[PDB]
RNA sequence: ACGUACGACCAUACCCAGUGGAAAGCACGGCAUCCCGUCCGCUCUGCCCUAGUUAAGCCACUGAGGGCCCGGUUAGUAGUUGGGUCGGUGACGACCAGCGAAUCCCGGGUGUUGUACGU
C-alpha cells in the first residue's frame, strides 16, 4: 500500500535574479531569504527548511494559487516567476524553483556506499500535481 | 637433522638479490606419481633455502630501534639491463 | 630490367606495330619524334594497345628514349606515356610505380625546372619551337603526376614525400606566364594533390621563395575569372590545416573568406565556362560537407537543473547571433539565397538540368550539415534562429514546385525535404498536403539505409512531429500503422526508421495528439501485435553483413519495448 | 601535480623499480588467465593490468608494445595467449627506451599446474619480496640461451625493491625455479613457491621446513628474440 | 524521456567501487607507505563507523587478501558497564583501548628464529572524512594510549587551535571521559525541556548523570586494562549454527533447477510459442 | 546457510522491468550544545538508537530481456609473411612453407571465495 517514508517533501527553494544591478539584488536576496546570497552574471541563493514552504507560500500568494501545466518539470520539480518583487514585501524580476524528494534521498549523495534511487521511489510529475492540488488547494491548468 | 648440507659443487650466493645459483644438477625422478617429484623438489628447495640463510646469518648483523635485528646486505653484483640510460 | 622473350603468337599480326617500335628503338630523334604520333594514333584505338604492352614498349620508352641527353626524344617519350596513361587505368599508374618512374619523373622536373627558371640565357629569348616543346613537357608531367596522385594513396603519399615536384608548381603557379592549358592542369593538379594532406598544405604555406599562398589568396579575394579553381586548393588546405573558425591561422583562416568569391561567381550565372559553375558548386557542397567535422572539431577541444530552471520558469528568448561561426553567417545570409536562385531555373537547357542537380546536391550536404546539430530544448538557440525562416524559405521556394512536377531528382528533393523537415519539426507551412504527395511518391517508388521508402518515411515522421494540424498528424499514424501491419513487403531498414519516427511522434503526454490520435485509433493493440514477428524478423537479419542494420533494429526493439511499458502505465 | 609525474618519467641517475604490465589476448584459456592472475598477485605492487582484451601479437608487430609503454611507463610485460598451435602461452617482454629489447615465450602445461587457492596456507604479505634459489645445470651455459635469459627475466620479476638493509622478520619465502640438465625432448623448467618454518633442532643454526604454497607451474621455452647488441651494450651499463 | 541509445565497450569498475565501500587508489597508497622498504610487514588499523555500532578490525594484507589478527567491537563495552551512546568519542577512545589491550594480550607481550620491542600500526580511515575532532582520531588515541605505537600527530586532535600550534589537554581530557556529553545535558536540561527528554531517553531511565557519566567512564577503562577478554550474550542466542543453517534454507528462495529450467522451457512454450 | 567489517578474482557480479525479504545486523531516520564545514546542518563533522519504515539502499527470485562468460566449433580458413617456386606485358593469380583472426552456429551458465565477529 502506502507508507509513511515515502511521503512527498520539499527539498529546497533556489532563488534566482539575473554590475551595479547585480550588487543591488544580492541584497534583496539576502533580506528575502536571511542567508549570504552567492554569485554565478545572476544571482542565486538556496533555502532550506521551516523557512522555504513559508517563501514557496509566499510565492503562491502572489500568483493567487494557480500554476499552468507546463510548469510541473517531468522530474518532478517545478517553478514559475514574478516580474516584481515589490509585491512579495527598483523593480526586480525572480523565479522560483522548488525540488521534491521523499525520505531517503541520502542514498544518492552520501560519501560512503553511493547508489542509485530506486524506480519505484522516484518522484513523477502527477504525484507533484496531486501533491500542489492537495496542499495549497490550487487548480492547475 | 644437520643445519648444513655438503654437495659436489659450491653454490654460488648472491646476498644483493637474496640469490643462491646452484650448479649441482638436480636428479629429476620422471616417475608417473607427482608426489615422489613433490618431495624431491621440496628436499632440493629446502637444501637451497638452507644454504642461503645460513650465508645470510654469516653476515653480520646489527639489532636497531625498529626492533628489527638488520642483516646489512652487499650491494648487487649479478648483472641486469636498464629502464632509462644514464643522462648526460 | 630483365630481358624476357616476346612471344608474339596473336591471331591478327601485328603489321604496323613492329615498324613502329622499329621506328622507336631507332637512334635518330626526328625519326623518334615522328614515330611517336603514330604511336599515340595507335595506342588511342582499342583491340592493339595491348599489342603494344606486348612488345614492352615501356621499359624502352623508359630505359632509353627519356633517359637519352636530346631533349626532343625525352619530349616524344613523354608525350607516349601521357598518351598510354590517359589511355590505360590505374594499375598501369601502379606498374609505373613498381619501375621507379617517380625518381625519374623528379630528375626530369628538376631539369626543367632548372631550364625554366633560369634567368642567365634567360629564359624569354628562347624561340618559340623550343618553349613551345618545353610547356609539352611540363604538360606530360603535369598529366602523369595527376593520374599517379589519383591512383592510390600510398603513391599519393610518395608523390607528396618528393619536394622538386613541389617545388615546380609553386613556380609554374607563381610565375603564371606558361600557356592558359598548362596553368589549368597544374592548378588541377594542386587540387588533387591537396585533398587530405597535411604536407602539400604545408609546403603551400611555408613557402618564401615564392609566397605561393600569398599569390593564391590574392587571386582568391579579387574578382579573377579563372581564381575560383584556385580557391578549393585553399579549402583543400583549410581542410589540411585545420584552419578554421575555432582557431583560425593566419589573416583569420577561414572558408568564409572564400565564400562570397565563389557567391559573386553564382552571380556570374545567368538563366538561358560552364566548368567554372560545376566546380564552384562542388566546393560549396564540400565547404558545406566539412562543416560538420569543423563543429565536431570545436566540441572536441547543476547544469541539468539549470537547465530545467530555465525550461520551467518560461524565461525563453532568442539573442546572439553566429559570431563565433563566421562561415557559416557567410553561407546562410548569402550563399543560401543564390542557391536557391539557381535550383529554380528553366529547365529548358541539359545544362540546367545538370547545374539544378549540382545545386540540389549542394543544398542538400548544408542542411543536412545544419540539420544534424541538435536544436533540442533550445540548445544552439542563435544558430536556430538565424537558420529559421531561410529553411522555411528553402520550403517555400524550392521543394514545394519541384515537388509539383526522374528517380535521382525525386532522391535529392526528398533527402533535402527530410533535411528542412529534421530541423523545421512540424512548423512546416502546409500548403496543397505535401504528405499526400510524399505518400504517393513512396508509393510509386514501389547501404539499405540510403532508398528512397527511408528518407520518405524520414519526411513524413518529422512534418507530424510537434504540434501540427491533428489531420496531418492523424494521416501520419495511420500510414505508419498500416506499414507496421503489412511487414512482410519492406525492407527493415523502412521498418527501423518507421519505429524510430513513431517514437519520436507520439513520445510525451503534454501533446493533444497523444489523447486525440494514438488512444482514441489503438494504435498500441497493433504494436502488441507488432512486437514479436519484428522480433523474429530482426533474428533474421545476418550479422557479418550488414551490422549497422542489426544493432540499429536491436536498438529499435529495446525502445519498443519500452515505449510499450511508457503507453502502458501512463494510460 | 604533473611536474612529479614527469620527474618519475624522466630518467634518473639511481633506478627506480620496474612497473610490469599484465595484458591479455584476443584468444586466452582459463588456465593461461589463472597463471597471469598467480603472477600479478606475486607481483601486486608494481604492476598494472589492462582488461580490454587488445588484439595484438608480439612478435610480428612490437610498435602497440612501444605505445603501451610510453603511455604507462612500463618496462616489464607478460602477454597470455592461446593457440590451436601453442596451447598456453606467457610471453615476456622486457623494453628499453619505448623499444622492445628481449621477450620470450613460455608454454605451460595444463594438467599440472595448481593455483594459489588450492593450498590453503599462510600466503606473501603484499609487496614482501622473496628470496630466490636458481638451482640447475641449465643456467649456467657459456652461449647465451634460453635458460640464461629466463633466469635473467625472472631475477627482473621477483626482485622487487632493492635495499641494502633486510631485517630478519622477512625472508619467510622462497621462489624455486629448477631446470633440467640439457639430455630428445625440450627440458622443462619448473617454478615453485615455498614458505619457510623454522625449527631449531641444531644447536646454533636454525633448520628450514618447507611447505608449499602458490603456483605450481611447469614451463617449456620455445619463440625467442634476442637482443641486439648495440642495445645490449648501452643498457647493459653501468652508471 | 526515451531513446535508451547504446555499449558493449563499457567496462565496470570494481566490485567495492561500485558499491562504494573502498577507495582502492588510499589503499594502494596506504600498503605501498607501510612497507618501510625494509621487507617487514606492518599491521594496518582500520576503523569504520556505522550507526549504532563501531568496527575496528586490525588486518594485515596477503594474496587472498587480508587476515584480522584481532577485532574489537562496540556491542562488548556493554559488559564493562556503559550501555549508552555506544557511538560517541568515548566510546571511540575505549573501543581503541580494548583493540589495544586484546592485541597486546594475544600476542604475548616454539622455535622462532629472531636469533621489548613495542608494536607497530597504521591507521586507516577509509571513505570518512579526515576533519578533526573525527572519532577516527579517538580509536587512533585509545590504541596510541593502550600501548602499540602509531605514528601520529596532535594536529587532528579536538581542542586544538590551528593559528597557533597549542593544544588544550583540558578539552581534550573532557572528550576523553565524555564531558561534552555530560555540559550537553545540562544545558539541554536547564535551557530545554522538550529536547532533553526526547534524546537521552535511556540516560534518563537508567538514572545517570554527568559525574556520574565521567567515573563510570574511568572505571569502565580500569576494567579494560584489568580483564579486556570478557564476552557478552543480548538479545537471542539460538546456538548450534546447523540450526540457523536449517533456519535459513527452509526460509530461503531456492532457484529452479536444470529440469526445474527445461519445465519453465516447455511451460513458456506452451504459453508463449504455443499460446 | 544468513548479516556486517576487511578483502581476492573484477559484468557468470553490469543494465532494464516485475515479485518477495523471519531473526539480528545493515540502513533510512531524529537533533544542531560542543569539535568542525557550508549560499543552505544537503553533503562533511558532532550528539541520540528512543520513535517509525522495509518505501528506497542491500539481499533473494522471476524474464523465449539486452549484454557478458565458459566449452566445442567457424579455421589451421580468411588475412598476412609479395617469405619461397610457376603463370601473367601488367595489375596480380596459382603453388609451398611460417605466422594466423572474427561473426554466425551448437551446448551450458548469471557469481565463486579467504579471514574475523555474529544472528
Not at chain 1, 79 to 95: C, P, R, T, V
Not at chain 1, 122 to 140: C, L, P
Not at chain 3, 390 to 405: D, F, S, V, Y
Not at chain 5, 44 to 60: A, G, H, K, P, S
Request: charged share 25%; aromatic share 8%; net charge positive.
Amino acid at each position: 500500500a502506502q507508507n509513511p517514508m515515502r511521503e512527498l517533501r520539499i527539498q529546497k527553494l533556489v532563488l534566482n535574479i539575473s554590475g551595479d544591478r547585480l550588487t543591488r539584488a544580492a541584497k534583496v536576496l539576502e533580506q528575502l531569504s536571511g542567508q549570504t546570497p552567492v554569485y554565478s552574471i545572476a544571482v542565486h541563493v538556496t533555502v532550506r527548511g521551516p523557512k522555504a514552504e513559508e517563501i514557496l507560500e509566499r510565492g503562491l500568494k502572489v500568483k493567487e494559487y494557480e500554476l499552468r501545466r507546463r510548469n510541473f518539470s517531468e522530474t518532478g520539480n517545478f517553478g514559475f516567476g514574478i516580474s516584481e518583487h515589490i509585491d512579495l514585501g527598483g523593480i526586480y524580476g525572480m523565479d522560483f524553483y522548488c525540488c521534491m524528494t521523499r525520505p531517503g534521498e541520502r542514498v544518492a549523495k552520501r560519501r560512503r556506499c553511493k547508489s542509485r534511487i530506486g524506480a519505484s521511489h522516484r518522484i513523477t510529475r502527477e504525484e507533484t500535481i496531486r501533491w500542489f492540488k492537495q496542499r495549497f488547494d490550487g487548480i492547475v491548468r | 637433522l644437520p643445519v648444513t648440507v655438503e654437495k659436489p659443487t659450491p653454490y654460488t650466493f648472491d646476498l644483493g638479490l637474496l640469490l643462491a645459483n646452484d650448479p649441482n644438477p638436480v636428479n629429476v625422478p620422471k616417475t608417473t606419481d607427482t608426489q615422489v617429484l613433490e618431495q624431491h623438489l621440496a628436499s632440493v628447495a629446502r637444501d637451497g633455502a638452507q644454504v642461503l640463510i645460513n650465508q645470510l646469518l654469516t653476515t653480520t648483523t646489527i639489532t636497531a630501534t625498529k626492533d628489527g635485528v638488520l642483516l646489512t646486505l652487499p650491494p648487487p653484483t649479478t648483472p641486469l639491463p636498464r629502464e632509462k640510460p644514464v643522462p648526460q | 630490367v630483365k630481358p624476357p622473350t616476346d612471344p608474339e603468337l596473336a591471331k591478327l599480326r601485328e603489321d604496323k606495330i613492329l615498324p613502329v617500335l622499329k621506328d622507336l628503338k631507332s637512334p635518330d630523334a626526328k625519326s623518334r619524334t615522328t614515330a611517336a604520333g603514330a604511336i599515340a594514333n595507335i595506342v588511342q584505338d582499342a583491340k592493339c594497345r595491348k599489342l603494344l604492352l606486348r612488345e614492352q614498349v615501356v621499359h624502352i620508352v623508359l630505359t632509353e628514349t627519356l633517359t637519352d641527353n636530346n631533349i626532343d626524344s625525352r619530349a616524344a617519350g613523354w608525350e607516349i606515356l601521357k598518351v598510354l596513361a590517359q589511355e590505360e587505368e590505374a594499375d598501369f599508374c601502379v606498374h609505373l610505380y613498381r619501375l621507379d618512374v617517380l625518381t625519374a619523373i623528379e630528375h626530369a622536373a628538376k631539369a626543367v625546372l632548372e631550364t625554366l627558371t633560369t634567368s642567365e640565357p634567360p629564359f624569354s629569348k628562347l624561340l618559340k619551337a623550343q618553349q613551345r616543346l618545353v610547356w609539352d613537357i611540363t604538360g606530360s608531367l603535369l598529366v602523369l603526376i595527376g593520374l599517379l596522385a589519383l591512383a592510390r594513396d600510398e603513391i599519393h603519399e610518395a608523390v607528396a614525400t618528393k619536394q622538386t615536384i613541389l617545388r615546380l608548381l609553386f613556380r609554374l603557379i607563381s610565375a603564371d606566364i606558361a600557356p592558359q592549358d598548362i596553368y589549368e592542369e597544374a592548378i588541377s593538379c594542386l587540387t588533387t594533390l591537396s585533398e587530405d594532406n597535411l604536407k602539400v598544405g604545408q609546403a603551400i604555406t611555408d613557402d618564401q621563395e615564392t609566397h605561393v599562398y600569398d599569390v593564391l589568396l590574392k587571386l582568391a579575394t579579387g574578382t579573377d575569372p579563372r581564381a575560383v579553381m584556385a580557391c578549393g586548393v585553399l579549402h583543400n588546405v583549410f581542410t589540411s590545416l585545420q584552419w578554421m573558425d575555432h582557431s583560425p591561422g593566419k589573416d583569420g583562416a577561414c572558408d568564409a573568406i572564400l565564400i562570397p568569391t565563389l557567391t559573386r561567381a553564382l552571380e556570374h550565372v545567368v538563366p538561358g565556362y560552364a566548368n567554372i559553375t560545376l566546380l564552384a558548386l562542388v566546393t560549396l557542397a564540400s565547404i558545406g560537407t566539412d562543416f560538420q567535422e569543423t563543429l565536431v572539431k570545436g566540441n572536441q577541444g547543476s547544469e541539468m537543473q539549470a537547465d530545467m530552471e530555465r525550461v520551467v520558469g518560461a524565461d525563453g528568448t532568442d539573442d546572439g547571433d553566429l559570431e563565433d561561426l563566421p562561415t557559416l553567417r557567410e553561407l546562410i545570409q548569402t550563399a543560401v539565397p543564390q542557391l536557391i536562385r539557381l535550383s529554380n531555373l528553366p529547365i529548358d537547357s541539359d545544362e540546367s538540368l545538370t547545374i539544378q542537380s549540382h545545386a540540389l546536391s549542394a543544398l542538400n550536404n548544408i542542411s543536412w550539415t545544419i540539420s544534424c546539430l541538435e536544436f533540442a530544448n533550445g540548445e544552439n538557440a542563435n544558430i536556430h534562429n538565424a537558420w529559421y525562416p531561410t529553411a522555411k524559405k528553402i520550403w517555400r521556394k524550392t521543394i514545394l514546385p519541384i515537388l509539383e512536377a526522374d528517380l535521382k531528382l525525386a532522391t535529392q528533393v526528398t533527402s533535402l525535404a527530410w533535411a528542412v523537415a529534421r530541423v523545421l519539426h512540424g512548423e512546416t507551412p502546409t500548403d496543397g498536403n505535401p504528405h499526400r504527395k510524399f505518400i504517393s511518391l513512396y508509393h510509386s517508388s514501389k547501404d539499405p539505409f540510403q532508398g528512397l521508402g527511408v528518407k520518405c518515411i524520414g519526411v513524413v515522421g518529422s512534418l507530424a512531429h510537434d504540434p501540427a494540424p491533428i489531420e496531418v498528424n492523424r494521416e501520419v499514424g495511420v500510414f505508419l500503422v498500416t506499414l507496421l501491419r503489412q511487414s512482410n513487403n519492406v525492407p527493415p531498414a523502412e521498418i527501423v526508421e518507421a519505429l524510430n519516427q513513431l517514437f519520436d511522434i507520439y513520445g510525451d503526454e503534454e501533446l493533444a495528439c497523444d489523447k486525440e490520435v494514438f488512444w482514441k485509433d489503438g494504435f498500441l493493440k497493433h504494436l502488441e501485435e507488432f512486437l514479436p514477428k519484428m522480433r523474429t524478423l530482426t533474428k533474421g537479419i545476418d550479422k557479418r553483413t550488414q551490422p549497422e542494420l542489426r544493432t540499429r533494429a536491436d536498438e529499435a526493439l529495446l525502445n519498443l519495448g519500452r515505449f510499450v511499458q511508457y503507453k502502458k502505465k501512463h494510460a | 601535480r604533473s611536474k612529479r609525474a614527469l620527474e618519475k618519467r624522466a630518467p634518473k641517475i639511481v633506478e627506480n623499480p620496474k612497473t610490469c604490465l599484465f595484458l591479455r589476448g584476443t584468444t586466452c584459456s582459463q588456465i593461461t588467465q589463472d597463471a597471469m592472475n598467480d603472477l600479478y598477485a606475486m607481483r601486486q605492487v608494481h604492476a598494472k593490468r589492462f582488461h580490454k582484451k587488445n588484439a595484438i601479437h608480439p612478435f610480428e608487430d612490437a610498435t602497440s608494445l612501444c605505445f603501451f609503454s610510453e603511455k604507462n611507463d612500463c618496462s616489464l610485460m607478460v602477454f597470455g595467449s592461446s593457440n590451436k598451435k601453442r596451447p598456453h602461452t606467457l610471453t615476456f617482454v622486457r623494453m628499453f627506451d619505448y623499444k622492445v629489447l628481449d621477450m620470450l615465450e613460455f608454454y605451460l602445461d595444463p594438467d599440472t599446474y595448481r593455483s594459489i587457492s588450492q593450498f590453503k596456507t599462510s600466503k606473501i604479505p603484499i609487496g614482501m619480496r622473496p628470496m630466490m634459489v636458481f638451482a640447475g645445470t641449465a643456467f649456467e651455459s657459456p652461449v647465451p640461451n634460453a635458460f640464461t635469459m629466463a633466469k635473467s627475466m625472472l631475477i627482473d620479476f621477483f626482485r622487487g625493491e632493492p635495499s641494502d638493509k633486510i631485517d630478519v622478520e622477512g625472508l619467510r619465502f622462497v621462489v624455486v625455479v629448477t631446470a633440467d640438465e640439457p639430455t630428445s625432448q625440450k627440458p622443462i623448467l619448473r617454478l615453485r613457491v615455498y614458505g619457510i618454518r623454522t625449527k631449531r633442532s641444531g644447536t646454533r643454526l636454525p633448520r628450514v621446513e618447507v611447505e608449499e604454497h602458490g603456483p605450481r607451474m611447469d614451463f617449456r621455452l620455445g619463440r625467442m628474440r634476442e637482443p641486439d647488441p648495440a642495445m645490449l651494450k648501452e643498457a647493459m651499463k653501468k652508471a | 524521456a526515451f531513446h535508451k541509445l547504446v555499449y558493449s565497450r563499457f567496462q565496470t569498475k570494481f566490485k567495492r567501487r561500485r558499491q562504494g565501500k573502498t577507495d582502492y587508489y588510499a589503499r594502494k597508497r596506504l600498503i605501498t607507505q607501510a612497507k618501510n622498504k625494509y621487507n617487514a610487514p606492518k599491521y594496518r588499523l582500520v576503523v569504520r563507523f556505522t550507526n549504532r555500532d563501531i568496527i575496528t578490525q586490525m588486518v594485515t594484507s596477503e594474496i587472498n587478501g587480508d587476515k584480522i589478527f584481532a577485532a574489537a567491537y562496540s556491542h562488548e563495552l556493554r559488559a564493562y558497564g556503559i550501555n549508552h551512546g555506544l557511538t560517541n568519542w568515548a566510546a571511540a577512545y575505549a573501543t581503541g583501548l580494548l583493540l589495544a589491550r586484546r592485541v597486546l594480550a594475544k600476542l604475548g607481550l616454539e622455535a622462532a628464529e629472531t636469533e621489548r620491542r613495542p608494536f607497530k600500526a597504521i591507521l586507516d580511515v577509509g571513505l570518512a572524512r579526515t576533519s578533526t575532532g573525527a572519532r577516527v582520531f579517538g580509536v587512533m588515541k585509545g590504541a596510541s594510549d593502550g600501548g602499540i605505537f602509531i605514528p601520529h600527530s596532535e594536529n587532528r586532535f579536538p581542542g586544538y587551535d590551528i593559528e597557533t600550534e597549542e593544544l588544550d589537554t583540558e578539552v581534550l581530557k573532557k572528550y576523553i571521559y565524555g564531558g561534552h556529553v555530560a555540559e550537553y545535558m545540562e544545558t539541554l536540561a536547564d535551557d530545554d525541556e522538550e529536547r532533553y527528554k526526547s534524546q537521552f531517553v535511556k540516560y534518563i531511565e537508567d538514572d545517570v548523570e554527568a559525574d556520574s557519566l565521567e567515573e563510570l567512564y574511568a572505571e569502565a577503562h580500569k576494567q579494560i586494562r584489568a580483564d579486556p577478554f570478557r564476552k557478552y550474550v543480548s538479545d537471542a542466542p539460538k546456538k548450534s549454527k546447523e540450526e540457523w543453517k536449517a533456519e535459513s534454507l527452509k526460509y530461503k528462495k531456492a532457484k529452479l533447477s536444470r529440469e526445474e529450467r527445461k519445465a519453465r522451457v516447455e511451460a513458456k512454450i506452451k504459453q508463449l510459442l504455443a499460446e
